[PDB]
């Protein structure tokens, strides 16, 4: 299974996207972070061209537990970079599962030519197996 970390010139920090920054968002007050319910937000809240129909339930102040990769919007349209140049799920409709599952076409853009699909490999598989197996001589010989 070959995959590319989903970097995207369209994703931004959750907090950069919030319109009304509240104490609960910024403060990072523990008392709150441990007793609030999950938060429903949409891809629109994470990518500029994010689909608002894709809703996700994240854990409070999770944006304070991890930072996202960054790609200057300039690479956004240069063919040849394996970045997601379009918010995930942009062409699958308001459907979460379809956004989460990797859409291989999302990468067609950056390859000179898939004469051998997108990836390919060759290897030697050395397998040794002990087992009860009469010799070929025994099989072909009757008596």
């Amino acid at each position: 299974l070959i995959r590319f970390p989903p970097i995207s010139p369209l994703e931004h920090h959750y907090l950069a996207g919030k319109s009304q920054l509240t104490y609960t968002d910024l403060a990072g007050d523990p008392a709150l972070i441990g007793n609030l319910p999950p938060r429903e937000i949409s891809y629109r809240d994470l990518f500029r061209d994010g689909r608002s129909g894709i809703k996700i339930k994240v854990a409070e102040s999770i944006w304070y537990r991890t930072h996202p990769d960054y790609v200057n919007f300039k690479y956004h349209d240069l063919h040849g970079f394996p970045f997601l140049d379009d918010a995930p799920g942009t062409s699958t409709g308001d459907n979460l599962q379809e956004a989460i599952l990797v859409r291989h076409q999302d990468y067609d853009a950056c390859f000179q030519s898939q004469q051998l699909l997108q990836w390919n490999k060759q290897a030697r598989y050395n397998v040794s197996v002990y087992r009860h197996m009469p010799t070929v001589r025994d099989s072909i010989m009757t008596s």
Binding site: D29, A31, L32, G34, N35, L36, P37
Partner: protein, 144 residues
């Protein structure tokens, strides 16, 4: 927040502002606006137990604040952070001394004052500020 010494009243201007009595049950009550009950709305027939949970949490932040974090600096200390004295413009306390003022009695000795006493309180004291570095122009005020 008086703007000029002239906005101060007779007593204040001449003797200084009044301060709090030493702390005791009746002079150190919880701030007058202390919550005695926290209400939480509920749909006509059900209650969101998850909300109730948050409700408490929220309350907790409110209480902590009312009880002891009313000053910005103290809230920040709450997080395990700190603030310079420039942050909220607080005067910097350089030295604090405290002591009891005792003295003696003077015995009355004439026909009518014999067996009477007058208390003369007279206490000696030292108040010493260790070498302090003044980073910017200003004043070093010492009050009693």
């Amino acid at each position: 927040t008086e703007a000029n010494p002239s906005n101060l009243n007779e007593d204040d201007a001449r003797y200084g502002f009044r301060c709090c009595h030493l702390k005791n049950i009746w002079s150190a009550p919880l701030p007058p606006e202390t919550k005695l009950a926290e209400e939480m709305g509920i749909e006509s027939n059900s209650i969101d137990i998850m909300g109730l949970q948050a409700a408490y949490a929220q309350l907790h932040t409110e209480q902590e604040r009312t009880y002891f974090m009313q000053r910005y600096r103290d809230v920040i200390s709450s997080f395990g952070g700190s603030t310079s004295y420039d942050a909220d413009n607080r005067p910097l306390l350089v030295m604090h001394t405290d002591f009891w003022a005792s003295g003696y009695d003077v015995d009355g000795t004439d026909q009518s004052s014999l067996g009477q006493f007058s208390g003369r309180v007279q206490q000696t004291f030292k108040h010493s500020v260790p070498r302090f570095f003044v980073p910017e122009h200003g004043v070093m005020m010492t009050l009693a």
